[PDB]
């Protein structure tokens, strides 16, 4: 069971603030601390600020600007972080994660994206990339799909809604225009296609859309 | 007997942009470092104190940080207003010491300066002295040349001249030159010019005035 | 009010001004001893507490004789106090015990 | 209220001594020491000593000549330092200011320069400087007035008593023959003059002298 659950992307205008929620499953205590760390995009892991539900104290990174406010829903569970007066400079990954107040993080959530910009939200558009019929197959066999002009990050894509790990390559996206663009890769053994199913499911957190596509031969 | 240590001693920055000043202390002194301003002809003035607690009267633009050896003052957003020298300051060991301190320098848009020549007072002149007075005021950068004219004639003798640090107004600087002579030196010349050559104008700005 | 329980109130009034006066002295003992750290007043006072109780950390001490004359006084008031209690819950329990067989 | 008051000058002459006041209003404590600090000219600030005029008791900087004895008047809320047998090295700016005993300097006084010379005093003589005829008026217009021939140091040079604060350098004193000489300058709009009124006025403290001076137009 999940521990910490928070959502997946929070697009934000400069100059606006946003709330991030962290919902804690699991065994509670009064002890507890919820962290949050915030990740900019390649550089690591920075201590923004800590809340003890329970008795609703919280502590702050002075070392950096005080964006934050942290607060808790001692009866929903939930911890949140208010981040205000953003800029692109405020644009990352926000890990929540709790610490039994022995010093360590035991467990993590899975982060937010935040991303600060004046952009539109953009559902991404979904393509199969079945091979070219003059294409002679190995034992194995690649397919793909296309995942392209969508804003703000991030995606999810997976293959048969996850029970397609083995053979799977996703590249990071490329920025072009104010839209995010990138590709998925499968690799499954010749035989075993298109006789069983291939299908890539992409969610986009920030749309709240999910979308489905077959991987069928060109007809 | 603590040494505190702030490196660097200058520091330029943009206006609207993240400045932060680094004291070190020679040994572990908690959280018992306190900041101070000191703008130009003024006393110092307490900014933070134990390392990262506000006083009241102080813009939130101004945090501070650290414990143990590491210490920092910082400014969200710094403007003209915050040119001034900082010192951080110990009360963790007897006796207090003191941080070498730090000048805070913003680096703004080129300025051209406005030049302005004062002939002598006839409140001066009678009392057998005369000073010419050109003002360069509010330039940027602070680098600038001042060339005094007679009648033509560069002059250079009888010439004094005083720039002011980084104006706390605008993050520009200004410079007054002094021509003095005596009433006798000053009578026997007809025009008196004080050139000014800029990084903004490969055309010295100028300015004249006959005694007549 | 019997005699055991004034003597404690007396000793805890008289504690709690050892602990003030104490704080005040230990830092006008303490500044222009270089090195000393017991030179101002709201730190003095968790010192004097630390001091009067015997638990003391050593995150703070005096270093020039009239710190330690000052610590000295602030020591024996802690302890004189802190068994003079002792010796009052000692008489009313006492006290208690000469009732409880008839006496 | 202005709680630490100290003169603006003194004059000493080399190896003679002099006593800087500072007097104290506001909330005084038992607990409250008085600082005193030095600072050279382009140089920063140097811890001197410290007493607590409560019980008298004064401590001073070791690692510096101890040309200092300090003192206070219980009644007259006053503090005393004594610097005796002074040369050039100790010509400075010493502020007093005001510790609770809690380590900071909350609050300081203006200080006192002291200038270690066998020169005379001098008042300064002031000069107005209003435009040369033929010089055109753009939205604005620049006045000044002149402050030679004084010593020792500093001058105040305030316009309209301290009305007009926008638009006024005062450059550095300059030195030559034992004398200073310096300028200020004022910049009204073109309109706002001389129809409305524009006075410097110029206090030195080591002559306690103040004068004002009008820059009306040239006759
Ligand atoms: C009694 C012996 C004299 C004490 C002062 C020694 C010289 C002080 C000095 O030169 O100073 C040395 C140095 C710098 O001041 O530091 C110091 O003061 C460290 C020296 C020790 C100071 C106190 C020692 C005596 C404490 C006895 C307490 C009473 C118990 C009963």
Redo the contacts with the bound molecule.
């Keep these: 069971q999940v521990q910490l659950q928070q959502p997946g992307a929070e697009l934000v205008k400069p100059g606006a603030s946003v709330k991030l929620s962290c919902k804690a499953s699991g065994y509670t205590f009064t002890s507890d601390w919820i962290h949050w760390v915030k990740q900019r995009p390649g550089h690591g892991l920075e201590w923004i600020g800590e809340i003890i539900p329970s008795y609703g104290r919280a502590n702050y990174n002075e070392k950096i600007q005080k964006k934050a406010t942290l607060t808790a829903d001692k009866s929903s569970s939930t911890a949140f972080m208010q981040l205000s007066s953003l800029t692109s400079e405020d644009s990352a990954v926000y890990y929540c994660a709790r610490e039994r107040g022995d010093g360590y993080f035991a467990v993590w959530g899975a982060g937010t994206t935040v991303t600060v910009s004046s952009a539109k939200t953009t559902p991404p558009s979904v393509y199969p990339l079945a091979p070219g019929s003059a294409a002679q197959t190995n034992s194995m066999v690649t397919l793909g799909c296309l995942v392209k002009g969508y804003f703000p990050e991030p995606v999810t894509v997976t293959w048969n809604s996850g029970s397609l790990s083995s053979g799977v390559h996703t590249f990071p996206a490329v920025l072009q225009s104010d839209l995010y663009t990138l590709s998925s890769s499968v690799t499954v053994p010749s035989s075993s296609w298109p006789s069983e199913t291939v299908t890539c499911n992409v969610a986009h957190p920030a749309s709240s859309t999910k979308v489905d596509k077959k991987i069928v031969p060109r007809d | 007997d603590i040494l505190l240590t702030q490196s660097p001693a200058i520091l330029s920055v943009s206006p609207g942009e993240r400045v932060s000043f680094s004291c070190r202390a020679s040994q572990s002194i908690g959280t018992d470092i306190h900041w101070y301003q000191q703008r130009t002809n003024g006393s110092p003035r307490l900014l933070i104190k134990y390392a990262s607690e506000s006083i009241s009267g102080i813009p939130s633009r101004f945090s501070g940080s650290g414990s143990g050896t590491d210490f920092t003052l910082s400014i969200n957003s710094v403007e003209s207003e915050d040119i001034a020298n900082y010192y951080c300051q110990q009360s963790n060991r007897w006796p207090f010491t003191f941080g070498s301190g730090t000048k805070l320098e913003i680096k703004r848009a080129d300025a051209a300066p406005t030049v302005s020549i004062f002939p002598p007072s006839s409140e001066q002149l009678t009392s057998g002295g005369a000073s010419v007075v050109c003002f360069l005021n509010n330039f940027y950068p602070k680098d600038i040349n001042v060339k005094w004219k007679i009648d033509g004639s560069e002059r250079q003798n009888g010439v004094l001249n005083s720039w002011t640090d980084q104006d706390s107004k605008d993050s520009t600087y200004s410079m007054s030159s002094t021509l003095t002579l005596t009433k006798d030196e000053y009578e026997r010349h007809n025009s008196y010019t004080c050139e000014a050559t800029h990084k903004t104008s490969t055309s010295p700005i100028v300015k004249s005035f006959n005694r007549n | 009010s019997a005699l055991h329980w004034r003597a404690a109130g007396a000793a805890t009034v008289l504690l709690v001004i050892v602990l003030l006066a104490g704080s005040y002295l230990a830092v006008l003992a303490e500044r222009?001893?270089?090195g000393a750290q017991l030179i101002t007043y709201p730190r003095a006072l968790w010192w004097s507490v630390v001091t009067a109780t015997t638990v003391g950390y050593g995150d703070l001490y005096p270093?020039?004789?009239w710190?330690?004359?000052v610590?000295?006084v602030v020591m024996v008031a802690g302890i004189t106090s802190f068994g003079l209690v002792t010796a009052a819950l000692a008489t009313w329990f006492v006290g208690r015990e000469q009732e409880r067989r008839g006496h």
């Design positions: 222009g001893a270089p270093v020039t004789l710190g330690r004359c610590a000295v």
